[model samples]
Target chain A: DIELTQSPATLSVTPGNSVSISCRASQSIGNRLFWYQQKSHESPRLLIKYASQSISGIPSRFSGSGSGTDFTLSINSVETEDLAVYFCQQVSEWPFTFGGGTKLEIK
Target chain B: DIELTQSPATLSVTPGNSVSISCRASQSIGNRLFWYQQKSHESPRLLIKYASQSISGIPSRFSGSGSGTDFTLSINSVETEDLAVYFCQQVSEWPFTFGGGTKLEIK
Candidate 1:
């Protein structure tokens, strides 16, 4: 199984600040990577699909980039509503795997 | 986007007991369904993929079944460590929606 290592297990930022989280895969996964947001006690919601591709209803402030072994999820002008855990997943192979997750907190 | 609804939002079972979680899709999705287990303070782990395929490293007591719109994840002789949230995701659509999740508790 491909492993994804996510950084910044915990993050602190003000409402207007911006932050970016990183996820590095153990191997190249092309563009089959995706991002999701999970609020406290809630199921995860898809934020980005197929790496940088945008999903409808998702804020423009949320964006994803990179391919191969390194990927990033950036939130611009972060809002209080963005306080949650973010996870990266790869669907490029069997037995898909997810990153450890980054918890975003509003300071 | 296909919406997945998981029933028995919460379940309580004793160790060595058997339990089943259900995920129903709003529309047909063939066998593009998957299941994940998420423990507190950790990343979600894939347990079953492609509806009923056994994932490597997953215990034999864990199994998945169903197709089209309804899917189930059954655990035989569940243990205390099995107390976690289970989520089902559908990859047949663009959005790749996930179920609300079922929380398992040790009784």
Candidate 2:
């Protein structure tokens, strides 16, 4: 079982600002990482996959990078609609693990 | 992209009672289904996988079943700690999709 740790458990950002959340794994998962966004009371939405692959219909402001034990999900020019929690996940096995999540709020 | 539809978005269950949540997929993804639990102010925890396999350290009371396009996560004799959000995710594809999630309230 791989343990995942995310930085800055919470972030306060203003609209149009950029934010980056980091996720580190105890062991390497190659490039099998995924990023997801979740707003209060809403289902989690996939933002990026395989480290940096884009998802359809997602805003172009969202991007991802890194591989192995380190990964980052960056949101450029964040919007109020983007004020939510973000998580990084690894699907290299059956029991997928997710980061503790970075809670984003509008300031 | 496979769409997962989970029903009864919110569940209110008494302690010691069993609660079951369903996840139906728009497309078949075999046994690549997973269940996760997210507590308040915490990251999601792995509960079940490959339809019914339990993850290490997780309670056995948390079980899963079914495959292909339909899956069920059953929590038997729930506890206070069980009060959290449950989500289902499918692996088997790019831009992996997660269910809308079921919020379990301990009433």
Candidate 3:
């Protein structure tokens, strides 16, 4: 099983501010990484797939980059609705795993 | 994009009883689904993979079954610790979607 580590478990930002979240895998995971946004009282929504591939219907402010062991999910000019937890997941190996998650709060 | 609907948005059961949750996809997705359990204030934990395949380290009492657009997650003799939200995810294509989730609580 591969372990994913997300930095700055908690983050506080105001609207119009841009922030980047990082996800690091214990081993190489190629480009089979995904990002999710989970709001309170709601299930997670896929924001990005296969590393940087944006998902349809997702906001343009959301973007992803990096591959292999390092990855990042950036939210530009965050909005009030963007106050939620972000998770990075890997499907390169069996027992698909996800990062601990980063909580984005309103500042 | 395929959407998933989970039955019994909320459930209440006793510790010694067994319970099952259902996930129905908007379209056929074969057996490319996975199940995860998310406890309060913690990250989601993968319990099943590829529909019926059991994940390593998951309790034997926890099992999954079904195919195509329907899936189920079952737990035998539930424990207090089993109370949480269960989510079903389809990995059949890009932009994987997860079920709204079913909250399991102790009666």
- Listed for every candidate in order, the interface RMSD values in angstroms are 12.2, 11.8, 12.0
For each candidate in turn, give its C-alpha RMSD to the true structure in angstroms. Answer: 15.6, 15.3, 15.5
What candidate 2 gets wrong by more than 4 Å, as runs, is: A1-107
True contacts kept of each: 0.00, 0.00, 0.00
lDDT per residue for candidate 3 within A7-102, as digits (tens), equals 888999889999999999999999989898877545567789888988778899999999889999999999998998898878776545677778
Off by over 4 Å in 3: B1-107
Superposition error at A35 for model 3 (Å): 0.2
- In the predicted model 2, the residue pairs found to clash are none
Minimum summed lDDT over a 10-residue window in model 2 chain A is located at: A92-101
Candidate 3 docking band: incorrect
Residue B83, model 1, lDDT: 88
lDDT of each: 0.85, 0.82, 0.84
> DockQ numbers for every candidate?
0.05, 0.05, 0.05
Please, what are the lDDT tens digits per residue for candidate 1 over residues B1-107?
A: 57788898899988999999999999999998889898864557778889998778889999999999999999999999998988888867544567777889999
What is the per-residue lDDT of model 3 for residues B26-70, given as tens digits with 9 covering 90 to 100? 999999898988784244677898899998888899999999988
